[PDB]
Amino acid sequence: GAYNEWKKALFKPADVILDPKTADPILLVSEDQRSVERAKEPQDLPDNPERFNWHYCVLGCESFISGRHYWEVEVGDRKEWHIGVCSKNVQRKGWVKMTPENGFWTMGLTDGNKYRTLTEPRTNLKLPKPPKKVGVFLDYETGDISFYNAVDGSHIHTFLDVSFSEALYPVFRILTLEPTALTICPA
Ligand SMILES: [Cl-]
Ligand SMILES: [Mg+2]
């Protein structure tokens, strides 16, 4: 459909790979750096400055300061996940709530069937179908971050008219221990 035919004409396909240096030690990054899973117990890793030590998060390797970009994530039958973008200068040590006010623009799924935006307060999304693949779209200049069902092109959510000043990284969060991973689709 139009989603498939037009996405690359309007947004540059980002080739996003996960940065293992940023990943909470309870997270596992795959060899090809496209997939993230949770471990039962934290790995023995250094608490280097780049690493999220409290939030179960991992960043992409590259950030954006301009232009239009997109990437797609296979969420599959996962019961829990959150994805989006965050500012380069988010607090990585300790906790602050994941909200736009704190530099996070994300949405996702909890408890299998509750889709929501990670806002203050959290906002419930009514989706006509559960997505299996989600497209994440950034327009830096207009300040829009949009999410689409990458299979049928349906709209999921848009953060509108954000005044970005900082560089933005793709961000991924998983809390639960389940058989299905969260996986980035290659560009
Ligand atoms: Cl949070
Ligand atoms: Mg340790």
Side-chain angles (χ1 to χ4, degrees):
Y3 174 85
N4 185 71
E5 302 304 315
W6 296 350
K7 62 192 181 184
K8 294 180 188 176
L10 259 180
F11 299 83
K12 188 180 188 205
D15 214 7
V16 180
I17 49 166
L18 300 172
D19 187 345
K21 298 178 185 41
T22 67
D24 187 292
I26 206 162
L27 297 181
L28 309 149
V29 176
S30 63
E31 170 70 17
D32 74 349
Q33 293 174 246
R34 302 288 194 169
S35 297
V36 61
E37 255 292 8
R38 226 208 77 184
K40 187 160 148 189
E41 289 122 333
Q43 304 173 259
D44 184 13
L45 297 175
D47 194 34
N48 51 289
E50 302 85 1
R51 195 179 306 283
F52 285 96
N53 80 346
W54 182 251
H55 271 305
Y56 290 10
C57 291
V58 63
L59 304 184
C61 290
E62 298 189 61
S63 61
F64 308 96
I65 41 80
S66 71
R68 296 188 296 278
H69 310 270
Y70 87 94
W71 55 98
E72 294 172 339
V73 183
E74 184 175 350
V75 301
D77 60 2
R78 280 196 59 91
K79 306 309 175 46
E80 194 277 341
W81 49 266
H82 292 81
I83 62 180
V85 296
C86 70
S87 293
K88 175 185 188 175
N89 70 343
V90 291
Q91 181 178 324
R92 304 189 195 197
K93 308 303 182 181
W95 180 81
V96 77
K97 198 180 276 209
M98 280 178 55
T99 60
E101 290 81 3
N102 291 317
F104 297 89
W105 295 267
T106 60
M107 62 76 50
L109 176 63
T110 317
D111 290 336
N113 60 26
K114 297 152 177 159
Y115 299 92
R116 81 274 187 75
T117 62
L118 294 193
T119 46
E120 181 63 72
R122 269 74 171 104
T123 281
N124 299 312
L125 301 169
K126 168 208 154 94
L127 304 184
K129 299 176 184 182
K132 305 299 181 192
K133 191 173 307 198
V134 176
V136 183
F137 289 74
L138 167 65
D139 186 331
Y140 198 101
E141 280 70 31
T142 69
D144 292 348
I145 300 155
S146 299
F147 300 82
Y148 293 89
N149 182 319
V151 176
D152 71 6
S154 57
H155 183 251
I156 292 172
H157 183 253
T158 298
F159 291 101
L160 287 166
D161 197 35
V162 185
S163 290
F164 300 126
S165 58
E166 286 280 296
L168 296 170
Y169 282 97
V171 63
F172 309 83
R173 190 185 85 172
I174 53 170
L175 299 198
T176 55
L177 253 192
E178 27 184 312
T180 302
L182 192 58
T183 301
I184 299 161
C185 304

